[model samples]
Target: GMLTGKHVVIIGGDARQLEIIRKLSTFDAKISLVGFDQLDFIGVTKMRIDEVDWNTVDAILLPISGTNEAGKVDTIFSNESIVLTEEMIEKTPNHCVVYSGISNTYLNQCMKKTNRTLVKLMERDDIAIYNSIPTAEGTIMMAIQHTDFTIHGANVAVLGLGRVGMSVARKFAALGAKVKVGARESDLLARIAEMGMEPFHISKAAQELRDVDVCINTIPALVVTANVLAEMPSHTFVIDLASKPGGTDFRYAEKRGIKALLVPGLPGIVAPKTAGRILADVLVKLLAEP
Candidate 1:
């Protein structure tokens, strides 16, 4: 157990945190939680602290949200007393390693003040790009679970034309479904069209949703609002691939009986073992570089 003898601290997370905790427990690592009140106590140490001790941990892990407005971290199981700030992270041991899905400006500045190594899971191409497969599959799974129609021959619209959107569009098109991509950038629109798919500009794409069978949004912003959802067919299934508070208007969709799903961290949810190993492998590469 390479990690067993070291102190690892995890700060603020959702179900993924639980999974990480379970993984660390298997390694018998000296696990300490920053915001979580309690977790798998087996072979792990759980802590409820206002600030990190810094000297105790060899590595500090953060969740997808990374940090809050006040620079605090949020662990779902905690009672909100576990506040983590940039200053707290700066206090970590000089050799301490920091990991998170995405890092904020404040967090980056904090790292400058310390000689700690930081890892951004979201930036790893090996895992992030590969995870898009499971994510895309999971999104289709949600569409199937909620809708009564077949994916084949469906008029599918994918918003954002980004990494996840491109994968989803390609997969759907491969299944014989008509795919249209919604994008804001001109170059992206051209690329989508070159991929043998239709491109619809965001400002104008809402009109196309009127007859679309499935709409998948990958933008993190509020692109699919009430007006957009109102135009879609009743049987249309909307899969939001953005981080949180996804693109589609769920409240309005529900009122209209339009099935919509907000799915985040699909890789870990649908395939934890594969996702975990992916994270570990990419992290090793990242750590080995520079």
Candidate 2:
């Protein structure tokens, strides 16, 4: 067991944290769970935020989304709210490292001010690649649910060519959809063409995107702006898989009578058990390393 005798504290999170607690417990780690009063485990200790002996904490695991701009953690399973702040990190041991799936501006600032190590699990290529699988599947599911037509023969425009974008484009293409990928980088455009999908520059996206039945935006930036949304067919469904306040112009999409959905963290929503194991497998390896 890599985590034998390790004192780990899991802060506010969703059901996936429960799976993480189970896996970590199997490794003999001394686990304390905060903001999880509604659940139970044989070897886990449940404590409130104020009751934690922060001085003894070796690692603090936050939710995948980490803290919001207000430093409030998302605690879906708890009735009481959980707030994480700089003072909390200041009380932890000098060797303590904060683990989160991702970090926000406020969380990053606090960690920097305290000189604490913050590890973002979602930044890892392995985790992102594995997560892309579920995300791609989720995108397909949303497309099917939102649109009345079949995915096959649908003209789909995929914006950006990153990990999630690539997976989405490939999956939609494999489904017999006419996939057109929008990207800025020459190499990414070449890759899209190589994959047998039509490639177009992002600058020409608004004009080129007019015919698509579905538009999926993986780019975090505002690529799918009012102009792009205006050009999309009225029946088109736009799915934004980017982070918060995703790439699509939601207001414009709605005004134009298009269905736009901003969906982040699809893996947690689709398959929490698989997502938790993916996180645990990577986390155990990282924790084991010196």
Candidate 3:
């Protein structure tokens, strides 16, 4: 077993954590599940946040949502509010590493102040690019359900050329939409052209985006400003693939009667099974011996 002598403490998470538990189980690690009393796994101990023996812990795994800004971890399997604190983290062995698929104010200040080694899994390229699979599909699904026009003929415009944006542009164009990608870089323009789609500077996006039946933004910044949304047609369908505080002008978009949305974790929402496996494999690989 890869983790024969290893002791991993995992906090509560969604179904994705279930997948991680089973895979880590196969490695024969001493698993202690915190805030997960409702369900149990083979040889896994169900314990509270503070009841576990912290000195024996080799690694600590947290939820995909990590914890809220207020320091409570979100759990579907528990009724109690699991508050993760800096003091508890400070009790763990200095060699123990803390892993979180996502993070918050508590984890941020705690990890830094406590000097605990923290690994943010979402920051990895392998995770983000693999995550783009479901994200792209979900974007397609949204455009299909929201619009009256078929994807084959709708003028599709995607902003940004990041992993998610590139996949989005490719999928829409492959589906026969009049695909146009908005990007700011010269290299990105070449890449977009290489993909056989229309590449335009993001600055003059509205000039060429007037027809724009479908608009999807992957940029985290406020690229789709009020002025830009005002220039677009009223019936445009926008799916902002960015996370918190998205690129689109939400208030202005609503005022203009446009259906614009900022959706994070669409991958987990649309295909939890696939998303779970992707996360599970990555976690297993990372948890294994160096």
Candidate 4:
């Protein structure tokens, strides 16, 4: 409802982009979409990527894919050469805000040239951290749906004690599973113990997986290999939430008959509406403030 009468511009984006547009339209916001191929939209201004007057827009939302030198984006609409270069962003006013997600170093460098503020949605503590709930829940749903064994009293090993790992551990523990967290930080180990869960050093992670029924990895690095998988039980199910080319070795898991799952973008899959609302809420708040 805060978007009432506000003018917002969205560049190339994915299905989540449509979710944001629908939610904001409910609040009476005037929306303009550029760099989009699907032109069958009403109550929405459709314009070419280079034609929009960026200075007049209240806020500009970039696609989650961000941009690289290739000019390829995550949006399905426009695949044309699109780049958020310094010259492109220079068209915006100093007070205008730009929002994106998980931008690269090159994008960050380009944004520094302009006075416009750049906000990365994936870095927002509130939005980013809260996202793990739906992500973890959806992952757990998969684990339950894929396996016949109940989680109660099962040996569950969670690698990495970051935001998502912590949530996974807590959720597993709540379901009466024996959860052990593998991490490097001493303070995180202490916190895990304080929460009444088991913790192990990252160095000893392979050893800890010997009796694990379900192995979940949040580490972005390659921590699970053939040697590591050899120690895990034959029936252990592995879920790697790390990005593409996940931390686990899929071939090794398959060769050894380990059930492995690599899931990404759980928030969008399990709760697109909530995820879009979260992003829109933060962007709208940022747009309303100085």
Model 1 ranges off by over 4 Å: 1-57, 63-91, 102-118, 123-127
lDDT of 3 at 135: 94
Q: After superposition, how far is residue 132 of candidate 1 from its true place, in Å?
A: 1.4
Extract clashing residue pairs from model 1. none
Which residue ranges in model 4 land beyond 4 Å of their true spot?
1-6, 22-29, 35-43, 76-87, 112-116, 244-246, 249-257
Candidate 1: lDDT over CA atoms? 0.76
Q: List the residue pairs that clash in candidate 2.
A: none
Question: What tens-digit string does per-residue lDDT give for candidate 3 at 1-290?
Answer: 27788899988888778878887888788899887888847868988886878878888888877888777877777775687788778888897888887777778998899899888988888888988989999999989988887999889999998988999999999899999999999999999999999999999987877889999999989988888888899889889988789898899899999889888988778887777788878777777755
Candidate rank order under lDDT: 2, 3, 4, 1
* Candidate 3 TM-score over all chains jointly: 0.95
RMSD to native for every prediction?
A: 4.7, 1.9, 1.5, 3.3
Candidate 4 structure quality by residue, lDDT tens digits, 1-290: 36665778888777677777776666667887876766455568877767777767777788765776554445677656555557767876667677887777666776776766778888767876778887888878887877779988888888988878888888888888888998899999998899898889988977888999888999988888888898889988999998778899999989999989888889878887777777777666676665
**Model 4 steric clash pairs:** none
The best candidate in terms of lDDT: 2
Question: Candidate 2: lDDT of 154?
Answer: 92
lDDT of 2: 0.89
Q: How many clashes does each candidate structure show, in the order listed? A: 0, 0, 0, 0
Reference-based TM-score of each model: 0.71, 0.92, 0.95, 0.82
lDDT of 4: 0.79
TM-score of 4: 0.82
The segments of candidate 2 whose C-alpha lies over 4 angstroms from its true place after superposition are none
